[PDB]
């Protein structure tokens, strides 16, 4: 029902036999000749390995399909991806405070399982 | 069922305003056509 | 890595006491052309690129300019009710076509959810049984670590 | 949205990796078992082929579907021109 | 801008109507004296079958490309959408399965830290006696 590159409600779906992953016609032929081979798999497909209706009730006020609905479409494209590069930029970020303090909890184990089998190993040693 | 060469504009925002001129002038090149 | 969820029934004060020791520790070790510029400056900036503000207002009695701009309301305005016509022919129909397609669309995630929903219980129904095995052989364990703890000294 | 062989509107729709349709998966089975061929086409088919990812999708409405419209607006005043072209 | 039987640039674009490929009139026609056949596909075609000539008639030799560009631009935007989103999801498995097994082993340390603290009262109060 939706296409798994853009995030689309496909015109013209067309499914890969490699994969079975549903895209939208003219994205999949753009992915194919840039590099060939499936998006999702990595695994090697071509434009003849492909095989081959949707409503949209246009508003009663459709002047604003060239100004203003044009105009929040070249917007609403603009702020997202910058908002999502945003998002990306912090992700990776907040990964290297994940992975130092792993390690950070790494080292107090370590140090603490000398320390506390030592200490139990004690016991057992005062008893003589 | 029965040349392809692809228009290379020149070096955003005023490709805006250029289809909405194309629009316009294509609106009177119509409109023009029909009174005659 | 052990550490038993289920089993350890862990205060937050414990959780702020590791937190602490975890913070010490780390107190030592410390593709797109032309588009995509204008876009992230678009973006950047926080201003859209301004559109033809002209059609709405116009001027009677202007010139040959607005004899131009009066000639663009008329057809625009024909084909504004030509294409208000072939809407309101079908009407309502077209429209709750497309509704019917939207309740397909909606069902489908819902049903996701569940799926899920369902394999996430199931790991941790497994991890649940595997925390309670241990937890008995750690009880084991103890109880027997400390019957030698005093064996041991009831002999001396 | 319905399923092509029954009629019905399929309850776990399967689409086919060979005629592009999209089945009931209770149907299609069958059909697979009774001979491994795909309904519509009659070219071969197991179960494995049928199929029932990050990206999040909104519904189709009036940026693709625009630039489509924007066809419709040209295409058809391209046809208001030979009106009065041939006239 | 070229015929399919000799490879020059065609100054009559002639075509058959059985197989969809432009040729040259002369040519063509030369092979369609030859034998009553198109060249392609082997089917029968006659000369009258033949479609000559340039078109251009109440038609008058822009717009239509600027929405094919529009579309073009926008075929790239969807593109560099889906490589951004894959990397912030695949992070984001990094992240959730990391914080997860922080929290996760900052349990051990809260276990380890009071069985070492248990090992010190108890051998503390044996070695004093």
């Given at each position: 029902?939706?296409?798994?590159?853009?995030?689309?409600?496909?015109?013209?779906?067309?499914?890969?036999?490699?994969?079975?992953?549903?895209?939208?016609?003219?994205?999949?032929?753009?992915?194919?000749?840039?590099?060939?081979?499936?998006?999702?798999?990595?695994?090697?497909?071509?434009?003849?390995?492909?095989?081959?209706?949707?409503?949209?009730?246009?508003?009663?006020?459709?002047?604003?399909?060239?100004?203003?609905?044009?105009?929040?479409?070249?917007?609403?494209?603009?702020?997202?991806?910058?908002?999502?590069?945003?998002?990306?930029?912090?992700?990776?970020?907040?990964?290297?405070?994940?992975?130092?303090?792993?390690?950070?909890?790494?080292?107090?184990?370590?140090?603490?399982?000398?320390?506390?089998?030592?200490?139990?190993?004690?016991?057992?040693?005062?008893?003589? | 069922?029965?040349?392809?060469?692809?228009?290379?504009?020149?070096?955003?925002?005023?490709?805006?305003?250029?289809?909405?001129?194309?629009?316009?002038?294509?609106?009177?090149?119509?409109?023009?056509?029909?009174?005659? | 890595?052990?550490?038993?969820?289920?089993?350890?029934?862990?205060?937050?004060?414990?959780?702020?006491?590791?937190?602490?020791?975890?913070?010490?520790?780390?107190?030592?070790?410390?593709?797109?052309?032309?588009?995509?510029?204008?876009?992230?400056?678009?973006?950047?900036?926080?201003?859209?690129?301004?559109?033809?503000?002209?059609?709405?207002?116009?001027?009677?009695?202007?010139?040959?300019?607005?004899?131009?701009?009066?000639?663009?309301?008329?057809?625009?305005?024909?084909?504004?009710?030509?294409?208000?016509?072939?809407?309101?022919?079908?009407?309502?129909?077209?429209?709750?076509?497309?509704?019917?397609?939207?309740?397909?669309?909606?069902?489908?995630?819902?049903?996701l959810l569940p799926q899920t929903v369902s394999n996430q219980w199931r790991i941790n129904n497994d991890y649940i049984?595997?925390?309670?095995?241990?937890?008995?052989?750690?009880?084991?364990?103890?109880?027997?670590?400390?019957?030698?703890?005093?064996?041991?000294?009831?002999?001396? | 949205?319905?399923?092509?062989?029954?009629?019905?509107?399929?309850?776990?729709?399967?689409?086919?990796?060979?005629?592009?349709?999209?089945?009931?998966?209770?149907?299609?089975?069958?059909?697979?078992?009774?001979?491994?061929?795909?309904?519509?086409?009659?070219?071969?088919?197991?179960?494995?082929?049928?199929?029932?990812?990050?990206?999040?999708?909104?519904?189709?409405?009036?940026?693709?579907?625009?630039?489509?419209?924007?066809?419709?607006?040209?295409?058809?005043?391209?046809?208001?021109?030979?009106?009065?072209?041939?006239?």
């Open positions: 029902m939706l296409c798994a590159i853009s995030g689309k409600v496909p015109r013209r779906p067309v499914l890969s036999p490699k994969s079975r992953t549903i895209f939208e016609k003219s994205l999949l032929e753009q992915y194919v000749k840039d590099t060939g081979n499936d998006p999702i798999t990595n695994e090697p497909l071509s434009i003849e390995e492909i095989v081959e209706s949707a409503q949209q009730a246009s508003l009663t006020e459709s002047i604003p399909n060239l100004l203003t609905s044009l105009q929040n479409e070249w917007d609403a494209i603009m702020l997202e991806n910058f908002k999502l590069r945003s998002t990306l930029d912090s992700l990776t970020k907040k990964l290297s405070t994940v992975m130092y303090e792993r390690d950070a909890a790494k080292l107090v184990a370590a140090q603490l399982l000398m320390e506390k089998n030592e200490d139990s190993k004690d016991l057992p040693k005062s008893s003589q | 069922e029965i040349a392809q060469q692809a228009s290379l504009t020149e070096s955003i925002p005023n490709l805006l305003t250029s289809l909405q001129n194309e629009w316009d002038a294509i609106m009177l090149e119509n409109f023009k056509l029909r009174s005659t | 890595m052990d550490g038993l969820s289920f089993v350890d029934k862990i205060p937050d004060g414990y959780k702020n006491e590791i937190d602490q020791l975890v913070k010490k520790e780390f107190a030592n070790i410390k593709a797109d052309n032309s588009v995509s510029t204008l876009t992230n400056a678009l973006y950047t900036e926080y201003l859209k690129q301004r559109n033809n503000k002209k059609r709405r207002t116009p001027d009677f009695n202007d010139d040959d300019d607005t004899l131009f701009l009066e000639e663009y309301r008329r057809k625009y305005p024909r084909i504004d009710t030509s294409r208000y016509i072939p809407n309101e022919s079908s009407e309502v129909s077209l429209l709750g076509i497309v509704d019917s397609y939207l309740k397909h669309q909606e069902i489908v995630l819902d049903t049984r595997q925390t309670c095995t241990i937890v008995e052989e750690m009880n084991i364990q103890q109880r027997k670590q400390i019957n030698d703890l005093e064996i041991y000294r009831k002999r001396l | 949205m319905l399923c092509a062989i029954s009629g019905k509107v399929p309850r776990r729709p399967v689409l086919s990796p060979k005629s592009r349709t999209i089945f009931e998966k209770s149907l299609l089975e069958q059909y697979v078992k009774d001979t491994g061929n795909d309904p519509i086409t009659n070219e071969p088919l197991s179960i494995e082929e049928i199929v029932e990812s990050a990206q999040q999708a909104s519904l189709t409405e009036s940026i693709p579907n625009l630039l489509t419209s924007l066809q419709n607006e040209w295409d058809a005043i391209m046809l208001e021109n030979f009106k009065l072209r041939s006239t």
